[PDB]
């Protein structure tokens, strides 16, 4: 992680297996019940988009929900792009560039890149932003798929 309490500069660490393994057991014991969201955020202490992608990937148990979460990530990522016109284009290759949806999501950003955004004047919380989009995906799942009936 890195964006924990921001009291870390270019500093970074790989998600402790303790924490990662914890995510697995969490969804393993509780599935997608409403409590899957809170524990997710807890085991996501301002981490990098990759670390987050790792977590999701770790417990991507069934394509059913993973689809709902995927569709949402994509839509949010695209929305970000809508209001981020790259204002007349990122003319000339060599600039750090404004983070794009696919970049914040991790698909088109390198681990180093993500670090760069998380350690720059003004810090672009790529991981934190992405962590918000994922949660929107999780809570949409939970809503339209979680409990049984009026028991």
């Amino acid at each position: 992680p890195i964006v924990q309490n921001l009291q870390g500069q270019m500093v970074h660490q790989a998600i402790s297996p303790r924490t990662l393994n914890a995510w697995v057991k969490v969804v393993e014991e509780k599935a997608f019940s409403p409590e899957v969201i809170p524990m997710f955020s807890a085991l996501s202490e301002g981490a990098t988009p990759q670390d987050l992608n790792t977590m999701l990937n770790t417990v991507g148990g069934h394509q059913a929900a993973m689809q709902m979460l995927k569709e949402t990530i994509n839509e949010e990522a695209a929305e970000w792009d809508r209001l981020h016109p790259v204002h007349a284009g990122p003319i000339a290759p060599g600039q750090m560039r404004e983070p794009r949806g696919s970049d914040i999501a991790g698909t088109t950003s390198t681990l180093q890149e993500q670090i760069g955004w998380m350690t720059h004047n003004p810090p672009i919380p790529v991981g934190e932003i992405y962590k918000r989009w994922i949660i929107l995906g999780l809570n949409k799942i939970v809503r339209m798929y979680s409990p049984t009936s009026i028991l």
């Epitope: 994509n74 949010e76 209001l83």
Partner: antibody
Framework: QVQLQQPGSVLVRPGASVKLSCKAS????????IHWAKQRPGQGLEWIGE????????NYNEKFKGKATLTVDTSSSTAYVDLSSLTSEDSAVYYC?????????????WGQGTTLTVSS | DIVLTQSPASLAVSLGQRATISCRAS??????????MNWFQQKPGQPPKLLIY???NLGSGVPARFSGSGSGTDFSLNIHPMEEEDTAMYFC?????????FGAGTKVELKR
């Protein structure tokens, strides 16, 4: 029952300015981006711009950049557009539309629109 | 901006038949496997009405009669079966680049 209520009609003389409103109701104003669209009778919809109540971020259409200024008043759930140096051209129906806060993004609610008349 | 060219200015669709209007963007309105081309309808005097979002996703409370299709640069709003009340103006808008743009519209009139 999210209500985007805005003035029926407005008459101003050329060279003046007018601040059109759009008193949002029903939903939590700071959730969605308010957009503004102009449409001259017998014509399509031009995009004036958009603004986000909880941040003041805006995106104006280069065309209107210089004519229209988007504002808001979170306190009283109302978005505004101030049209400068009004001329006969500006006479068109001005709609205010909410951009849904959720994943499926698109214009989900429209105000009935205010008709402007810039005449002598 | 990112221009959208709508095919016919007007189109007379006989009742029960199929109305086909098309919208062509100067650029691909695609992103993350999503064609962000929306279709709206408009009755004289009132504000627009979303029919189809995401190029083919029907909106809420829009009769199945309205269908969407397209990808990247070419899109089409297909009405079938065409019913009387459908006399309206139709526009397509790209929800892809910051300066959202609209089409010049198509006037779908019912051929009686």
């Amino acid at each position: 029952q999210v209500q985007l209520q805005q003035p029926g009609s407005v008459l101003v003389r050329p060279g003046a300015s007018v601040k059109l409103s759009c008193k949002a109701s029903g939903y939590t104003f700071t959730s969605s981006w308010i957009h503004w669209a102009k449409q001259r009778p017998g014509q399509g919809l031009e995009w004036i711009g958009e603004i986000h109540p909880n941040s003041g971020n805006t995106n104006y259409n280069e065309k209107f950049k210089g004519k229209a200024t988007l504002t808001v008043d979170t306190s009283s759930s109302t978005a505004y557009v101030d049209l400068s140096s009004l001329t006969s051209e500006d006479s068109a129906v001005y709609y205010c539309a909410r951009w849904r806060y959720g994943s499926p993004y698109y214009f989900d609610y429209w105000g009935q629109g205010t008709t402007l008349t810039v005449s002598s | 901006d990112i221009v959208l060219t709508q095919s016919p200015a007007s189109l007379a669709v006989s009742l029960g038949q199929r109305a086909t209007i098309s919208c062509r963007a100067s650029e691909s309105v695609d992103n993350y496997g999503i064609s962000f081309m929306n279709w709206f309808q408009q009755k004289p005097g009132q504000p627009p009405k979303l029919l189809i979002y995401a190029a083919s996703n029907l909106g809420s409370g829009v009769p199945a009669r309205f269908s969407g299709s397209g990808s990247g640069t070419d899109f089409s709003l297909n009405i079938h079966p065409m019913e009387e009340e459908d006399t309206a103006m139709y526009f397509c808008q790209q929800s892809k680049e910051v300066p959202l743009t609209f089409g010049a519209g198509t006037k779908v009139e019912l051929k009686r």
